[PDB]
Design an enzyme around this catalytic site. Sequence first.
Site, mmCIF file in Angstrom:
data_model
loop_
_atom_site.group_PDB
_atom_site.id
_atom_site.type_symbol
_atom_site.label_atom_id
_atom_site.label_comp_id
_atom_site.label_asym_id
_atom_site.label_seq_id
_atom_site.Cartn_x
_atom_site.Cartn_y
_atom_site.Cartn_z
ATOM 1 N N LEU A 46 -6.434 -2.762 11.538
ATOM 2 C CA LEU A 46 -5.585 -1.644 11.116
ATOM 3 C C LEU A 46 -5.467 -1.604 9.582
ATOM 4 O O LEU A 46 -5.377 -0.541 8.983
ATOM 5 C CB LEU A 46 -4.208 -1.830 11.718
ATOM 6 C CG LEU A 46 -4.137 -1.724 13.233
ATOM 7 C CD1 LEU A 46 -2.723 -1.994 13.702
ATOM 8 C CD2 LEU A 46 -4.620 -0.387 13.712
ATOM 9 N N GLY A 55 -3.970 -7.295 4.085
ATOM 10 C CA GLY A 55 -2.941 -7.790 3.173
ATOM 11 C C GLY A 55 -3.460 -8.680 2.038
ATOM 12 O O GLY A 55 -4.604 -9.155 2.050
ATOM 13 N N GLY A 63 -2.782 -11.403 4.269
ATOM 14 C CA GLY A 63 -3.133 -11.164 5.704
ATOM 15 C C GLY A 63 -4.235 -10.163 6.117
ATOM 16 O O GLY A 63 -4.905 -9.539 5.288
ATOM 17 N N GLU A 64 -4.447 -10.044 7.427
ATOM 18 C CA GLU A 64 -5.064 -8.863 8.034
ATOM 19 C C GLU A 64 -4.110 -8.342 9.138
ATOM 20 O O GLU A 64 -3.347 -9.092 9.672
ATOM 21 C CB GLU A 64 -6.394 -9.249 8.634
ATOM 22 C CG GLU A 64 -7.445 -8.148 8.647
ATOM 23 C CD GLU A 64 -8.741 -8.582 9.361
ATOM 24 O OE1 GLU A 64 -9.781 -7.892 9.233
ATOM 25 O OE2 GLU A 64 -8.724 -9.626 10.062
ATOM 26 N N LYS A 85 0.077 -9.113 12.460
ATOM 27 C CA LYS A 85 -0.273 -9.492 11.116
ATOM 28 C C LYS A 85 -0.704 -10.974 11.209
ATOM 29 O O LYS A 85 0.014 -11.826 11.707
ATOM 30 C CB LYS A 85 0.922 -9.363 10.182
ATOM 31 C CG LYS A 85 0.633 -9.747 8.741
ATOM 32 C CD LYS A 85 1.955 -9.738 7.959
ATOM 33 C CE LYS A 85 1.852 -10.317 6.570
ATOM 34 N NZ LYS A 85 0.856 -9.510 5.867
ATOM 35 N N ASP A 109 9.683 -2.272 -1.685
ATOM 36 C CA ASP A 109 8.426 -1.579 -1.935
ATOM 37 C C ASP A 109 8.217 -0.350 -1.073
ATOM 38 O O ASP A 109 7.185 -0.145 -0.435
ATOM 39 C CB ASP A 109 7.241 -2.591 -1.788
ATOM 40 C CG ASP A 109 5.970 -2.159 -2.550
ATOM 41 O OD1 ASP A 109 6.021 -1.290 -3.440
ATOM 42 O OD2 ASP A 109 4.908 -2.753 -2.235
#
Length: 273
Positions: free
Chosen positions: A13, A16, A19-20, A36, A120
């Site tokens: 999706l 990061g 991450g992924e 995540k 954010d």
Amino acid sequence: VPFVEDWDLVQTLGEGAYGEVQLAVNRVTEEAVAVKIVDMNIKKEICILKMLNHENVIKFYGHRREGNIQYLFMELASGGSLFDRIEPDIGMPEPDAQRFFHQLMAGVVYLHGIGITHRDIKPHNLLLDERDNLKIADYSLATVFRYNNRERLLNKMCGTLPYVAPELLKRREFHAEPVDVWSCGIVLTAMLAGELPWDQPSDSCQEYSDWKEKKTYLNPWKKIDSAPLALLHKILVENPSARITIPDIKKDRWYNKPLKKGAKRPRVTSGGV
Ligand SMILES: [Cl-]
């Protein structure tokens, strides 16, 4: 074909810094969630994540550590980001912008009410479910600004420069809530104009100077109707103690303007009308 316990990780999706994020589908139940994946602070994120329970915030389902890798299971928002609904140089229809703004305020009020600041807020982090309901996602920069009914000021600079409030660059310490409010205003600007007003809210940025001088004949302001623009004038105020608060946003004329027709009645599947 990777998997974690009862879930298969079937589609990437996004990505990061650390991450992924994968679409995870449960082999038995067919439930679809987002996961995540972190290689190897995240303890802090998890504590905040477990606090979250609101229709306009991505829910946390739990986590798993397998050796070096953490998995954080989260509600899926299958419509993807608000970012992808904003047509560049155009924006989106005002009634749609207003609705998303309504939802965004509802999620931000919620978070502020449990003493959490996201830090954010930007269209990339605002995801849509299958009915286009907005969900505030990604709590990796999030922190506690109120605990035991006592506010703490923030001092770490973080976020994304075009969305960041000027005090964050100017003051040693600053209140959390007006910073989040400012970034909601930049989001609203992007929804109504399909363009960001400035690179950053600093005295050396011409476009920001132009706004403080009220040159609203310039883009992006000139694309924005007078009602939502009057709201933006109350939000994008340099002094954070003079900036409008969320209780007062909810009193604003554009915020309360009827604009959007309701969805058509749902199809009959059984019984009558
Ligand atoms: Cl944009």
